[PDB]
């Protein structure tokens, strides 16, 4: 900055996770299963989570075998907190598995006050002619999780994971999913 | 006499092959209840659990052959008197997630046969259980959790005297396993879908029966405060607008005794019921014989001016909805000596010369 | 060894053991089976059964005369 | 799609054939005692009772094929150090009568 | 059983050992190829045994008597021969499999292939001593490495 | 910024170094031997260090002769310190050798509050047909160290060095290493 680059593309919002309400001050985290569309908060912290249903998410949930790059944009709001009093940071971690033994594939570290953005990507690639069935016992294939940590949940209000397929993306096969409930984005007045 | 054992042909990695006798690997016994309803799971098990407790010629070859380049043929030898009829649908899906929907809509995508026992003595169809490669194995499909599902989409129009059984014969034929892979090219020559456009009930009588199925197919099919999803239907909703030659496959689900003549046409939602000039539009008449059960409507590029939207807002009424519908109109009247509705199942097989425009942000809902 | 026949014989073992010894073992599956041609067929089975909801392995010896409906559990024990 | 089921190749009366893997139909386990004598029956069963409790590639083909024009190969993979040795004899006879002699001669 | 998820070293106490080439192959997530083993006799010629080798998955128990349904390779050694090369072609593997697996996965739920080594008859000899046998994956022909391993941290499966 | 570029690749975390606990306020530093995977803190300061075992690190430790580019991502956390009270800075220095006489190959200088990231690269290149045996007496070959300085260790909690091979990377030869202990990343709740 101060002059920006140029964002261009259509990224659809998949998964929001609002942070637990007052007086909960302790450090906390959440995990977005990027492929299977699930949001498991750590411990017994009452995060307020929603999974929306844009076409990207419906494909990622129903498609069995997947291949190629998906671009993510993690947005962070944002409580109305005086800039000089801000001490909140956000550590994120891409992971293959959610087991203790597995390592991170990427770490990011953000301490921008109020709000932040974080574009990254990663290639789903798998054994079966370049395709990956997420979490299949076959070949011990695994997903991609996105562990995210709010060091100060009083100041960080919510995470938000937007996604987009690169044009190289390819799926095959169907999974029988249950009926998806109609959760809608409550836009801010 | 002695021989060198290392150099024998015991590392034979051939696929399973031979006649249909020597490639059979399981038979399965489905029970059809005397009084079964629509949307009714008859069988639902993993495709590898089919082969448990079996002793056919290729059963041990199937389990132990590391690679199989051939497709799986399944044939179903179920029959019933022409008097009655129903519609069964066997269907293979690459996996599951807990508490799943078994609505015909959800299932049919991917690989399926649909048949009416009343008309067709038997019905066979081949498929590849690994949809993104030339090969597969028994160990692949056991751990991948490939799921076979038989469903009754329309009940018996006239119930049989006793319960019935459908014998499925699982074999391995010697066709090449070709993969079906969806991708984000804007222009594609053949985008298969197997999208269940809907079951059309027409009651017996005299009234103007008209049924609209919207061609804004994307964003799933409805439920309670919920919606269902195939992959291919979710895939087409990646794009905002689209067009192409649409290849429907309309199927009889009632018995041969319930007779009716059906006009199909493309047209827009504003047209009311009790508008008596549907045959001004270009249309296609569909009479079924006793034996015929299946008929393919195609609608060329001259039926559509522009592309239309994949999804529409749920709250748009028929009055202000500028995407095309597929009308299905009774040309005469639904008749028969026996009581029962004239059921009819439409299935968008695929779009030829598909052209997908733009990039859908998405809508969230289903019907229009 | 036809796995379907062996599954039925393994269930018969657990059922006969339950009858004979007033137990409630829950059959899970067969692990191993040996057929030995004798006066009829003798089967040596290794199988999983739940005791108090706890999976355990058992060996069973089952004698079958295929020309009669004769099936006899000869012995049943944990491995 | 439908097909005429009467005209399929389900009345295939071929013999069993292929590689040595796909024609194997049973394996048998003979126990040779640490201290065995001469004139000592190790195994003695009917040739059909060999195939009981078996699950190899040609086991079901073998049982169900009405005619077999091929021979039966049997191979025995037993070994011992050059230091020692014995003499085994496997042998097939078309039948029996009660309380039979199992002398090598017979 | 010897697992073909070879990557991430071999075990020790609360530790693991590493070659370079084995650490190198674990750079990739999934892989495949013609595997060229080199099985060697380590005991004396007097201890005699016949060994079947085959690719297969972990679920198969011991006292499952039909290993020769699978395609396999028999290995008898003469007095003078000491070394024998098993090759397993591309037709033995459907897809690629993972280079590393989590240590706590049991044999029941482990979808990568193993290399089984099964005694075809029985281990024998006039003199006492075990029948030792050393297997060494020499190399992978037509190697195809997919993806990019984040890593796992552990060894055996 | 505010709109970011796009991170893409798999970087595996190699070496963490937490900073000495209270009341230690003085300026301090640490050195990551990037190739041989060792973490020597300066003086007698009790830093809490760990070396993890992703495939990159195991190759770098066992491979004798190496060639080509490795991309590093140095992340810095991050104590919960009010942004207007932050005075902590981070000087880093690539070096060939750790002797006083040798000069730096690169210096970076960061004073971003809370947290920071720093991507750079460097080419290992050596005498023996473009290959470098790290720290061999032969040809007086040398490693690459990464000296890092926390001016305020109360505010800087920890360093973290993630790494990735460029596709041009090449090794040869093996070194007999001792058994690597199984240290695992303790992920933040």
Residue numbers in the entry:
A (entry chain A), F (entry chain D): 1 to 189
B (entry chain B): 1 to 368
C (entry chain C): 32 to 110
D (entry chain G): 1 to 106
E (entry chain E): 212 to 368
Source paper text:
For this analysis we used Cowpea Mosaic Virus (CPMV), a plant virus from the order Picornavirales that has been used extensively in biotechnology and as a model for single-stranded RNA viruses more generally. Affimer proteins are novel affinity reagents which mimic the molecular recognition of antibodies, but can be isolated quickly and produced recombinantly.
Anti-CPMV Affimer 3 was selected as it did not cause appreciable aggregation or clumping of CPMV particles in negative stain screens. To overcome this issue CPMV was applied to lacey carbon grids overlaid with a thin (<3 nm) layer of carbon. This causes the CPMV particles to be immobilized on the carbon support, anti-CPMV Affimer 3 was subsequently applied, excess solution was removed and the grid was finally washed prior to blotting and plunge freezing (see Methods and18 for more details). The global resolution of the resulting structure was 3.4 Å. The viral capsid has the highest resolution, and previous atomic models for the L and S subunit fit into the density with clear resolution of the bulky side-chains in both capsid proteins. Due to the icosahedral averaging applied during image processing and structure determination, these locations have two-fold symmetry applied, which is appropriate for the viral CP, but not for the bound Affimer. As a result, the non-two-fold symmetric Affimer structure is inappropriately averaged meaning there is not clear density for the backbone of the Affimer and we are unable to map the position of individual amino acids. EM density is visualized for the alpha helical domain of the Affimer with the base of the helix bound at the interface between two L subunits. Previous structural analysis of Affimer proteins has shown the location of the variable loop. Due to the location of the variable loops, we propose that the N-terminus of the Affimer reagent is facing down into the capsid as this would allow the Affimer variable loops to bind to a portion of the L subunit in the CPMV capsid.
